[PDB]
Symmetry: C4
Subunit: 194 residues, 4 copies
């Protein structure tokens, strides 16, 4: 079908791009593996498809695609369904590979991440490593402080995450301001542990 | 024709997307029906076509496509034709299915809707009322910048034109006295609530 | 040629669009003639092509294409060539058909127009009609005043124009502020005539 | 071969555009030569490809493509690798042809350039010409002063450059403020020589 063909064609152009730029074989394989994990052999113009729909259908789709994620977290599971929809609509799906630095300590943080599937290591230089997995989130501290990252976060396994930018976080909280407290609780607890 | 082929091909992609995401059969039927009602078996890159034209032709097209909507509302039918063209230019066509919540009470409202064809049910949580062809709703929050005073749910398929609060205010920069039309309606409805 | 095929395929889409929306025959004829005059049987992804180039080549192309326009106006012919290039780069080519309102009196004006080829009729309601043609410009008054249009301007012949937005006008004049005087002289003259 | 076909098809479109606009044969050849030097017979939708990846992979790619440029400049070679990545991510690759004015004296400057390969001539009207080549940069003075260009800079040879806008320059320096000093040192030295 057309979506399988689109993946095969797009991947051929990626191979050619990597060849043109003389990328090493190991990195070429890393890109191969990334495409397999991220797109699973099919590609869609999701923006175009979703843009063809209406609000209700888009909201039904995002809620469906994120059912498990939502179930995982009391943040979403116990909230106003209109809040959950608002936040889910803003999320960006991202895949990271083992060893990737998702967050680097000391940098200016502008995104947080919700873990759909995978394990990450949180490492504050000089402190003990802590791990987070399915149904946890991280990177909230900088969304609240507008400061610098308090720890590095690396992918231990392949990680299927949803990211949320500070502007989108704040935009949603304009409508649901009391939900900020959920994130502050976590941030405070983590800052105490650090 | 290329436009029918575009629909058929675009719809196949949508089927594959729904398959990939494992969406339930009933939802897939709902999406299929949406595409049939919204696009009627043809698809166009409207933005590209309109972008190829000039101002006069774009304005002629939007006026023609909306001529019935315009005749159906004193707002537009009795107004400066240049105001009508300015407002029509900002409208976005949207189709909603029976049961859809177009507006949810209590949310921050940033759009209003003009009913070209269809019936909606308006409810403040009491006693429902209905609006149909030639009515508009959602104006209150465009004026107040507050929260929705009622939920509005499609009873039939609804062919609507939406207008964002920013586009509303932009047009009213040039035609400020037209704001009164919307305020009259909002005041009347707030009194009824 | 690919550009000729593009025109033919694009125009078939337009025909189908017009059919779908049930536009009257006379309107369809009008659209057909517009495509012929504006595109002359060929179409290019001009944005894409120019985006593939560099500054110097883009500037050479716009200067070449506007050679006659520039020669026709002391504004451009006598000016710093860097000013001319800056202004030309901002211009948008537009074609209008006989009878078209280019500007409507009393509306908020945000663009001016340079006449490459054609004749327009300038009319302030209640006043005498006058004509402008190749090498004239109009619509400058509102760029300077930020007020309402002082006259309507309608295409008499087919008009090949270049438009310039108020923001682009002001942007160029940030760098070449003394060039504002040229437009003011013309505006002052016309206001006195009105 | 999809990328080679893309170049061949894209260039046919360019030839036809030039024919439509009646460009002289010498200019057409100049455009042909530019496409050969800039794209080298292959074209990619780089924005699309990079947009399909994640942060870590994009950063790996930009670091790889620029590693020699980085090696050549103490600015980058001795810096926090996170600063280098942040700056590299903002760079735009540009190719200029012999004789091109990259910078014109007295104009409002909004970009600087890093030389990957080529020779440029710097000339302040009335002063002695100076040359710069691989591993030098120029155009920094206006990014710091927000004033007018202190010299013209012309391509002596074909020049393969990376440009950086003033807004991107300042954005990166929000995170790495002390790195502004490197550019000020160079600017000061050059202003002294002028
Ligand atoms: N002790 C901890 N346990 C779990 N997560 C942590 C801990 N310390 C820091 N983090 C997370 O690591 C993230 C690094 O980026 P932020 O500082 O924005 O937000 C931080 C927290 O979400
Ligand atoms: N009694 C009523 N009759 C008709 N429409 C109403 C009534 N009450 C509320 N509405 C509409 O329902 C809309 C809900 O969104 P708004 O509050 O923005 O604007 C409201 C009105 O347009
Ligand atoms: N007597 C006149 N002669 C030439 N041009 C005119 C005259 N009166 C008005 N105009 C032009 O018509 C334009 C209408 O839009 P503006 O008022 O922005 O700017 C106006 C002038 O450029
Ligand atoms: N003597 C010099 N040696 C090297 N580069 C110079 C000299 N004088 C000016 N420049 C460069 O020429 C550039 C022209 O644009 P800027 O003034 O923005 O920044 C200037 C410097 O980067």
């Amino acid at each position: 079908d057309s979506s399988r063909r689109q993946y095969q064609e797009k991947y051929k152009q990626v191979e050619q791009y990597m060849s043109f730029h003389k990328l090493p074989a190991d990195f070429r394989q890393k890109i191969h593996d990334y495409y397999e994990h991220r797109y699973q052999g099919k590609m869609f113009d999701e923006d175009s498809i979703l843009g063809e729909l209406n609000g209700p259908l888009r909201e039904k789709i995002v809620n469906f695609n994120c059912r498990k994620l939502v179930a995982s977290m009391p943040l979403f599971a116990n909230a106003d369904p209109n809040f959950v929809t608002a936040m889910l609509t803003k999320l960006k799906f991202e895949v990271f590979q083992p060893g990737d630095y998702i967050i680097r300590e000391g940098t200016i943080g502008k995104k947080m991440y919700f873990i759909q599937h995978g394990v990450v290591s949180v490492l504050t230089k000089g402190n003990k490593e802590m791990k987070l997995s399915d149904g946890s989130y991280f990177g909230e501290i900088c969304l609240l402080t507008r400061g610098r990252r308090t720890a590095s976060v690396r992918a231990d396994t392949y990680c299927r995450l949803y990211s949320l930018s500070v502007d989108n976080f704040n935009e949603v909280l304009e409508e649901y301001p009391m939900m900020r407290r959920a994130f502050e609780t976590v941030a405070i607890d983590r800052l105490d542990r650090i």
